[PDB]
Enzyme design. Structure first.
Site, PDB file in Angstrom:
ATOM      1  N   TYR A 140      79.187 -26.665  94.651  1.00 45.24           N
ATOM      2  CA  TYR A 140      78.392 -27.299  95.695  1.00 45.24           C
ATOM      3  C   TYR A 140      77.727 -28.531  95.094  1.00 45.24           C
ATOM      4  O   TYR A 140      77.092 -28.454  94.039  1.00 45.24           O
ATOM      5  CB  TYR A 140      77.322 -26.333  96.210  1.00 45.24           C
ATOM      6  CG  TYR A 140      76.420 -26.936  97.262  1.00 45.24           C
ATOM      7  CD1 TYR A 140      76.916 -27.281  98.519  1.00 45.24           C
ATOM      8  CD2 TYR A 140      75.070 -27.174  96.997  1.00 45.24           C
ATOM      9  CE1 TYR A 140      76.092 -27.850  99.489  1.00 45.24           C
ATOM     10  CE2 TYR A 140      74.236 -27.746  97.962  1.00 45.24           C
ATOM     11  CZ  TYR A 140      74.758 -28.079  99.204  1.00 45.24           C
ATOM     12  OH  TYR A 140      73.952 -28.639 100.169  1.00 45.24           O
ATOM     13  N   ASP A 229      77.741 -32.219  87.197  1.00 43.78           N
ATOM     14  CA  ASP A 229      76.664 -32.024  88.150  1.00 43.78           C
ATOM     15  C   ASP A 229      75.716 -31.016  87.526  1.00 43.78           C
ATOM     16  O   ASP A 229      75.938 -29.803  87.591  1.00 43.78           O
ATOM     17  CB  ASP A 229      77.187 -31.495  89.488  1.00 43.78           C
ATOM     18  CG  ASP A 229      76.078 -31.345  90.518  1.00 43.78           C
ATOM     19  OD1 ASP A 229      74.895 -31.380  90.116  1.00 43.78           O
ATOM     20  OD2 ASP A 229      76.380 -31.182  91.718  1.00 43.78           O
ATOM     21  N   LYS A 257      66.468 -31.179  90.863  1.00 45.44           N
ATOM     22  CA  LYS A 257      65.588 -30.019  90.840  1.00 45.44           C
ATOM     23  C   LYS A 257      64.479 -30.039  89.784  1.00 45.44           C
ATOM     24  O   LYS A 257      63.437 -30.645  90.007  1.00 45.44           O
ATOM     25  CB  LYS A 257      66.437 -28.748  90.737  1.00 45.44           C
ATOM     26  CG  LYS A 257      67.317 -28.557  91.975  1.00 45.44           C
ATOM     27  CD  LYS A 257      68.094 -27.246  91.967  1.00 45.44           C
ATOM     28  CE  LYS A 257      68.701 -26.999  93.341  1.00 45.44           C
ATOM     29  NZ  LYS A 257      69.529 -25.769  93.409  1.00 45.44           N
TER      30      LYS A 257
HETATM   31  C1  PMP Z   1      74.761 -28.310  91.651  1.00 46.36           C
HETATM   32  C2  PMP Z   1      74.026 -28.836  92.864  1.00 46.36           C
HETATM   33  N1  PMP Z   1      74.252 -30.095  93.307  1.00 46.36           N
HETATM   34  C3  PMP Z   1      73.619 -30.619  94.392  1.00 46.36           C
HETATM   35  C4  PMP Z   1      72.685 -29.836  95.100  1.00 46.36           C
HETATM   36  C5  PMP Z   1      71.927 -30.313  96.314  1.00 46.36           C
HETATM   37  O1  PMP Z   1      70.649 -30.762  95.863  1.00 46.36           O
HETATM   38  P1  PMP Z   1      69.779 -31.243  97.132  1.00 46.36           P
HETATM   39  O2  PMP Z   1      69.596 -30.048  97.996  1.00 46.36           O
HETATM   40  O3  PMP Z   1      68.351 -31.750  96.610  1.00 46.36           O
HETATM   41  O4  PMP Z   1      70.488 -32.398  97.981  1.00 46.36           O
HETATM   42  C6  PMP Z   1      72.421 -28.506  94.660  1.00 46.36           C
HETATM   43  C7  PMP Z   1      71.408 -27.621  95.399  1.00 46.36           C
HETATM   44  N2  PMP Z   1      72.077 -26.454  95.983  1.00 46.36           N
HETATM   45  C8  PMP Z   1      73.098 -28.002  93.532  1.00 46.36           C
HETATM   46  O5  PMP Z   1      72.853 -26.730  93.102  1.00 46.36           O
END
Ligand code: PMP
Ligand code: PMP
Lengths: 420, 420
Positions: A140, A229, A257
């Site tokens: 994701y 990521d 995060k």
């Molecule tokens: C690996 C990863 N990349 C992107 C995101 C999305 O971050 P955001 O919700 O702040 O757009 C997440 C959050 N689930 C994530 O875990």
């Protein structure tokens, strides 16, 4: 739960699905509303204290309202919270982050992990002059078109043009054969390969060394940029994140995060050569009214200092280990097939399957059992994600009494569900 | 400016172009760094007080660190700043916003105007089942592929696939003939028409009534959704924004900036029928770790209450009017061609052109003159955007001494530049 029930009724007609983010709607029996959070606990609007093993899905490795971070934010608030021009905190945070993830490189702060991966993808395409992006089933990367795709690439969300989806290739996570095959067929058109070093949104799934090796080799030999990521792994798997933890190197490192201390954030880091393509230096566009938000910067800076000065990693690791050992002791006695994947402070339980090394296997886990466990744990004052495909996160406050409650809660909840 | 100079040197190798957002790099002679902001003023790291006519490019209509908003944020901070589950503030803010922009509808909170317009576009495509999006030359909707396009649609940024750009149509702002022609040719494939009711990123450009009329008629007759990008106009042109100000109605209303009180924000509002397509209710995906961020919600709620209880609109309108009258008095005497476009509290000066009703005309304005004006005004303690294509914003603190300084500064700066 009268107050949460009332709020539940009010939001039904205000928000689609009654929530501002999908996962929030799955809490059983129905979503509780939060009054406040402090340390290892969330407190419902009705007044109930709950041990938090979700930690807002990753950002709160220091727990709720960490004293050091609170003080830094209070000082930052007194200075005004938005300027529209450069501030001091963004400089200090950038220097600290780059020293750990990309020494001598550059960074660009954005407002969400979604904006971050989206920017990284545009940068990889701009740098290579190629169109295709390769992602993995189960990974994701946020809420933007290019990553809302699955292998026929076809859209996994309505409203995403097929013409856009077809520019994204998808193969299974940890599948070296499939990875080699996709590069053999499309390699010269792949601008970048994006991947979570440790999957956190299909349960928790650790990477195979052979998969990590292939990712680095194939990207380098093909000319595609390796986009790690690390929105979740960054600063969670140690100060150096996944690169340091697994001894791997990415061309572009996506962060989020934790680096925001709990405030809206995202970031893209990479070599000067790649990062220099971003506006106003280059032609790859990126701008944001809230980029490098003063409070996000101050909160992130204080958070990283805590990670450097406090035993966050050891405490968090031990908390996750205790939970894993407790669950394993109970489950081993049942003889039922199951597996628990844990990497430091991120983990998840999968009932019904003896191995989970990819999304396909994670999807085979017993969802009904998990939902019952989530509900029983909440009844016992412990909050774990309502979805088996989310992760369990531990942090600094998960020690002493808080940890005892979590472990005892997990043990009892498992026994209750297993006895039903 | 020794301290700003030092920071300038440090960021050169940390951020592309030395900044986290393009416009910030254009400040002359070089970007000053901000220590804090309060009321109508920004204070540089070297200690200089500057009247702020940028207001972070729109969000700070109440000025810096507004007392009411500060108190609300302090209370919110004490409750922890991120939960990962529903809070109370998001409910109250949603109810207040919808009561003004889409009664009986729904809303989804995101983290930037970019995320907001991106989500709106996905929603329009999902609802209509169509691919094409129509935007106008000069309109800015954020940093995402679908809106980084210009009429050959071709990419205006590197890293944007041509296949993606071609799904976006582009015609001139305020050009009814061109608008009718594009719908005659592609109308049945247009999922949505996105537009700023008042352009704010090509200087300030007011809409023609005939253009607004055509937008509503053609969208309704073709089946395309009218997406009003009110990220800037929302809550600036009165509580009801552009819809109330111009007596128009949009299918989807994109909001941002002001509704966040100065914290990262974005939002999409619309009818229950359209909004219900968003996950977890429908299949149009949207999720966000920071969606409905507790602090953003608390700050936005307090901000809107101030807009309802304090004379923000009258004060801001009068401030902009005073600046416009002062500049006009000086410029009228020169006999030189020029035009000032103002809509309530947003405005911009264009030297060298007698009329600016579209981006093409705005681009013909004397950029060198504007840059000199920006630099001279800053030398006199007044901060206006470094780019002639940005806007000048006024707010609540622009009264009394602060306004006197701004007006006198504008008068003197114009005379100085005109005399050079
Ligand atoms: C690996 C990863 N990349 C992107 C995101 C999305 O971050 P955001 O919700 O702040 O757009 C997440 C959050 N689930 C994530 O875990
Ligand atoms: C009309 C409009 N839409 C979208 C945006 C982008 O908002 P954000 O920077 O928070 O992504 C802006 C800000 N320039 C805007 O003025």
């Amino acid at each position: 739960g009268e107050k949460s029930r009332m709020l539940f009724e009010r939001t039904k007609e205000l928000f689609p699905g009654g929530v501002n983010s999908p996962v929030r709607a799955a809490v059983k029996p129905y979503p509780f509303y939060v009054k406040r959070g402090e340390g290892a606990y969330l407190y419902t609007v009705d007044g109930a204290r709950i041990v938090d093993l979700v930690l807002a899905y990753g950002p709160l490795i220091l727990g709720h309202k960490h004293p050091r971070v609170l003080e830094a934010v209070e000082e930052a608030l007194a200075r005004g919270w938005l300027y529209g021009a450069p501030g001091e905190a963004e400089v200090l945070l950038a220097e600290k982050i780059l020293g750990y993830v990309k020494r001598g490189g550059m960074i660009r702060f954005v407002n969400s992990g979604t904006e971050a991966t989206m920017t990284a993808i545009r940068l990889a395409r701009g740098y290579t002059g190629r169109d295709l992006i390769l992602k993995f089933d189960g990974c994701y990367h946020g809420s933007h078109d290019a990553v809302l795709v699955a292998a026929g690439g076809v859209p996994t969300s309505a409203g995403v043009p097929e013409a856009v989806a077809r520019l994204t290739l998808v193969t299974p996570y940890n599948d070296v054969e499939a990875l080699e095959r996709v590069f053999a067929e499309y390699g010269d058109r792949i601008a970048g390969v994006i991947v979570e070093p440790v999957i956190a949104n299909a349960g928790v799934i650790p990477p195979r060394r052979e998969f990590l090796a292939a990712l680095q080799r194939l990207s380098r030999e093909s000319g595609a940029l390796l986009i790690l990521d690390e929105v979740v792994t960054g600063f969670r798997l140690g100060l150096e994140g996944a690169q340091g933890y697994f001894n791997i190197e990415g061309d572009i490192i996506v962060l989020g995060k934790i680096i925001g201390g709990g405030f809206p954030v995202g970031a893209v880091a990479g070599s000067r050569e790649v990062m220099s393509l971003l506006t106003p230096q280059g032609k790859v566009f990126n701008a944001g009214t809230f980029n490098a938000h003063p409070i996000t910067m101050a909160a992130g800076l204080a958070t990283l200092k805590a990670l450097e000065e406090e035993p966050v990693y050891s405490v968090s690791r031990e908390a996750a280990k205790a939970l894993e050992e407790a669950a394993s002791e109970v489950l081993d006695r049942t003889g039922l097939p199951y597996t628990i994947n844990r990497v430091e402070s991120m983990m998840q339980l999968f009932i019904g399957v003896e191995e989970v090394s990819n999304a396909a296997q994670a999807r085979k886990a017993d969802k009904k059992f998990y939902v019952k466990l989530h509900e029983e744990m909440l009844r016992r004052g412990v909050f774990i994600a309502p979805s088996n495909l989310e992760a369990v996160f531990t942090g600094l406050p998960h020690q002493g009494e808080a940890l005892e409650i979590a472990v005892e809660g997990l043990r009892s909840s498992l026994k209750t569900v297993l006895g039903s």
